[PDB]
Design a protein around this ligand. Structure first.
Ligand SMILES: [Zn+2]
Ligand SMILES: [Zn+2]
Lengths: 53, 54
């Protein structure tokens, strides 16, 4: 779980930074067990499907 | 005007959460929105976007 969060959060960092450069709001947030948007973690994590989109 | 409406509805919900939290013995940590500090991304620009206000 934690490795996959790290992996996903790296992706999120990259999207936000790109959003910033393109003059859009950078609205994405990092994942944790209490708010997670990876379907395969539902149960182990709180699946919040549209957390980041 | 619609900006204000969404601050009201969000603030109502902040109120409710804070009180629930107090009731269960946890601090009232949520903070109210205004045009000068707002965490609704869609408002960004018209409001001061403070992403992690809450
Ligand atoms: Zn997860
Ligand atoms: Zn606002």
């Amino acid at each position: 779980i934690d490795r996959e969060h790290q992996e996903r959060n790296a992706e999120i960092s990259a999207c936000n930074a790109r959003a910033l450069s393109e003059g859009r709001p950078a609205s994405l947030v990092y994942l944790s067990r209490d708010a997670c948007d990876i379907p395969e973690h539902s149960g182990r994590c709180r699946f919040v499907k549209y957390l980041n989109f």
